[PDB]
Design a protein around this ligand. Sequence first.
Ligand SMILES: CSc1ccccc1N(C)C(=O)N1CCC[C@H](C(N)=O)C1
Ligand SMILES: [Zn+2]
Length: 139
Amino acid sequence: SGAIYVGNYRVVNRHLATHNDWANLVWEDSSRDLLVSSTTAQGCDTIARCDCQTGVYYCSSRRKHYPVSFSKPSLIFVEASEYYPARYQSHLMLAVGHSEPGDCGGILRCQHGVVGIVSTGGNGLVGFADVRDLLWLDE
Ligand SMILES: CSc1ccccc1N(C)C(=O)N1CCC[C@H](C(N)=O)C1
Ligand SMILES: [Zn+2]
């Protein structure tokens, strides 16, 4: 679980969006596993605008923040789960790190701010949904 709170926006994994989220929708993309809903109060997260490939992510299944190197946002095969059929997920970055289902929503941050949120994983892999291209989150 977890979200990004920037301006009057709440950014969550689309597969974990609550009933309150769909009733206040701004934008969603199934192929990216992202959903953005509107908020009444202003949030304080800053979105990174960079091409960093090193950062720190929060892993709820270990209660630890880990430093990682991560790939550039790409179209990557994601196996079928209870939330999506087998498909390519776009704008996804992989790192070598622990993750389990339950860790989705953990923030990945670099020196410039929020880069993305945990969205997928594997044996010793963790995947993050990038948000650095969503320039409109700033305005
Ligand atoms: C952190 S998720 C995880 C971690 C280790 C191992 C497996 C997973 N699973 C199952 C995973 O990748 N998911 C389930 C949630 C939806 C994901 C998606 N964006 O399509 C696919
Ligand atoms: Zn950066």
